[PDB]
Amino acid sequence: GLDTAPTNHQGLLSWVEEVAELTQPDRVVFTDGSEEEFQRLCDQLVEAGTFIRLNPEKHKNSYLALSDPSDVARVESRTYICSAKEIDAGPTNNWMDPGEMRSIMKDLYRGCMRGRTMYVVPFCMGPLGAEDPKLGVEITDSEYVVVSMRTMTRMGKAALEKMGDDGFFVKALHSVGAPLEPGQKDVAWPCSETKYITHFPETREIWSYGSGYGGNALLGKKCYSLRIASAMAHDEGWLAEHMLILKLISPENKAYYFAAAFPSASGKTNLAMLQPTIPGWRAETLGDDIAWMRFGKDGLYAVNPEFGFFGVAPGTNWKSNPNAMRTIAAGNTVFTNVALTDDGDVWWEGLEGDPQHLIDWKGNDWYFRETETNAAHPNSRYCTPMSQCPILAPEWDDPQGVPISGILFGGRRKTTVPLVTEARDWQHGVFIGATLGSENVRRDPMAMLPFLGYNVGDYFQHWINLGKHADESKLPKVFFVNWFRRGDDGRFLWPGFGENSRVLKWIVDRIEHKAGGATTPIGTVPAVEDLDLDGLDVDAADVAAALAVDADEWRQELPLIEEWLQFVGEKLPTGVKDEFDALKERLG
Ligand SMILES: Nc1nc2c(ncn2[C@@H]2O[C@H](COP(=O)(O)OP(=O)(O)O)[C@@H](O)[C@H]2O)c(=O)[nH]1
Ligand SMILES: [Mn+2]
Ligand SMILES: [Mn+2]
C-alpha cells in the first residue's frame, strides 16, 4: 500500500490502514493537490473513458464526464443522520440506529475496493489562515472525486501540514461500491444500485457508499459543509447555512454584505452574481451555496467554506449569467453530463446557438427538432475554481470573513408573500426563516430541509439563542423576499434578476435609516413610493400588487404554518410558538 506518506499523523495512518484492511485496495495514494497530480489523474480518467479532454483551442485544460444514468443526483431517500438517539435527528431527517447502520455499511465496504486505488484526500474547509481551520480527509476509490475535490476544496499538501501529527479532522469515507475481480474490465462510471450517504454527528464522520456523483461523493460539498458543520455549529456557537454571500457596493463606494438562503431553483446563483441595474451600484460575490457565520469581537462574520463552484449547467448563458460563463471560459473545468458538440466543445439547453447535431450525455446521437430527450442532463454540472470568477470579491480568501448587514430568506410563491418584508426583530426573523415555503406549498426552513445535521426544532432554538445572547444593534436585519409572485393573468408582477438590486437598495436604505415602510401583520413592508423604480419599465400597480399584504391570503396561510410547526414536534421552540401566536393575533 503506502507507508511512504507525507505525514507523521498516527491517528490518520491508523485510520487509513484500518479502512484499507476492510476494503482491500490494490494500493493507497495520498494526494498532494499539485497541478501535476491533477494532470496525471485527468490523463488516467481520459484513458479509462471517464473523461473526454475538450478541444484545447476552445477551452484550456477542461473535461467532459458522462455518468451512468443510474447515478445522477443526490438521493435523499438513502441519506441518513445516525445520531445515538432518534430525536436528535428529528422529523426532517432519516434516522437509523448507529449500530444498525455500521453493521450494514461495514458489510458493504468489506472488499468493495478490490482492483482499485484507494486515494486519501486531505482538505481544508474555509481559508487556510484560520485559528481553527476545519479540516477533513476523504478516502475514496474514485479519481473523479479526487479531481473534483481539488477544485471544490483547498486540497492536499497545505491541508495535511495544517493537521499536524495529532489535531482533529473529519473522517470522510467514500466508495463507488463496484469492486473488480482480477482480469475484469472496468466501466467508465462505476457505481452501484445499493446507495447510502450516512452522517455520524457525534464523531463528525461521513460514510458514503454506492454513488460517485456530486454531493454523494464530493463529501465537502453538502455532507461536511452543512450536515456535519451544522452539528459543529450547534455545539461551538456559530452557524452553518445554505446561503449565498453577496457583496453589494453603493455609488458612494460603501460595501454591504448579505447572506441569503433560498432553496435550489429559487434563485441563489442569480442573486449571488447580480449585475445591478441602478447607476453606480455594482456587486461582487463570495459564494452561491454555503455560508459559515460566526460572531467576532462585535458583528456576524461570513466565510465561504468552499473553494469552487459546482453549478447547474442547463440555463446558463451569456445573457443570463455572463459572469458564470467567464469563470468557465478560463478553463480548468470538469463538465458532468453536458452534451458534446461536433467541434469538441460543450453545449446544454439554454446555451447560445442551435447546434443541429450533438452527442448527448448518454453518448448517443442527438438531433434538432427530433430527439425527444435533452442533450445535456437537466441537472448537469460544471465544476470550476472560485478564483477564475471575474466578479469574485477580494475578501473571498480572508479567514476573518465579512460583516453581514442583512440575512435574506425566500422561495417561489405565486401568491401571499410580498416582494420584500423586513422582520420586526430577531426572533420574528428566526420565525420568518423557520416557516419559509416554496412551490402544494413545501416548508423548507432556512432552505435547510435536506441538510440539517440535527433536530430541526433544536436548530431554531440555536438560531434564537445566538440572538438572545448578542448586541441587537450589531445583529444583521432579517428580510423575506419573493421574486415569483404573480398577477391574475399569471405573469410575474416583478421582473426580478438585475432589477432585484432595487429591492436590495431598499434593504440598504433601511440599514442607513434612509427609507421607510408600513408596519404590517407580517413585519415592515415598503410602499411603491419607497422603492427606486426610476428607469424601470413596469406598471406601478403591478409593484403595489407585489407588495400587498392581504389579510385574507395570510389567514389561509395559518393552517399550513400550523401543520408545519406540529410536524416539527416536541423540540419546537417556545420562541417560534410565540411568533406564530403573535402573527395570528395581528391578522385577527
Ligand atoms: N422570475 C424570476 N426568476 C428567477 C429569478 N432569479 C432566478 N430565477 C429563475 O429561477 C431558476 C433558478 O435560478 P438559480 O439562480 O439557478 O437558483 P439556484 O438553484 O438557487 O442557484 C432559474 O430557472 C432562473 O431563471 C428572479 O428574480 N425572477
Ligand atoms: Mn444547492
Ligand atoms: Mn445554484
From Swiss-Prot:
Binds 1 Mn(2+) ion per subunit. SUPFAM superfamilies: PEP carboxykinase N-terminal domain, PEP carboxykinase-like. The active site is at residue 266. It is found in: Cytoplasm. It catalyses: oxaloacetate + GTP = phosphoenolpyruvate + GDP + CO2. Mn(2+) binds at residues 222, 242, 289. GO terms for molecular function: GTP binding; manganese ion binding; phosphoenolpyruvate carboxykinase (GTP) activity. InterPro entries: PEP_carboxykin_GTP_CS, PEP_carboxykinase_C, PEP_carboxykinase_GTP, PEP_carboxykinase_GTP_C, PEP_carboxykinase_GTP_N, PEP_carboxykinase_N. The keyword Metal-binding applies. PROSITE patterns: PEPCK_GTP. Substrate binds at residues 74, 213-215, 264, 379-381. Its EC number is 4.1.1.32. Keywords: Cytoplasm, Decarboxylase, Gluconeogenesis, GTP-binding, Lyase, Manganese, Metal-binding, Nucleotide-binding. It is an enzyme of class 4 (lyase). GTP binds at residues 265-270, 381, 412, 497-500. One of its GO terms (cellular component) is cytosol. Its cofactor is Mn(2+). Pathway: Carbohydrate biosynthesis; gluconeogenesis. Belongs to the phosphoenolpyruvate carboxykinase [GTP] family. Monomer. This is Phosphoenolpyruvate carboxykinase [GTP]. It comes from Mycobacterium tuberculosis (strain ATCC 25177 / H37Ra). The gene is pckG.
